[PDB]
């Protein structure tokens, strides 16, 4: 598991690498973050690294992953946002999650 960001046209992108998973995680568009748990993909610790997209002109604050959460097995991702915006999940392949 890992996480990315990057840029297009729509904006700040949060490419995701989830490796062992089937479904689609829950997304929980706040108007503070982003929320994405992953059941049955408890992610390492040393796999939660956040990233420092400050200042790249994006509607995303900073993309931060955290493993630990207080349920067994889940794992979850907090996207800080800021002023109005919209959020648009893509799954190009089962495995690979993507938040423009």
């Known amino acids: 598991k890992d996480v990315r960001f990057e840029e297009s046209s729509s904006g700040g992108r949060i490419v995701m690498k989830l490796s062992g998973t089937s479904g689609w995680k829950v997304d929980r568009p706040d108007p503070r973050s ?34 630990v959460p207080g349920a067994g097995g889940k794992v979850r991702l907090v996207v800080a946002a800021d ?12 495995t690979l999650s993507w938040r423009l």
């Open 34 to 67: 982003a929320v994405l748990t992953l059941d049955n993909a408890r992610l390492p610790k040393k796999f939660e690294r956040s990233l420092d997209t400050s200042a790249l002109d994006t509607p995303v604050k900073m993309i931060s992953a955290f493993s």
């Open 83 to 94: 002023g109005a915006i919209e959020e648009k999940v893509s799954q190009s392949a089962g």
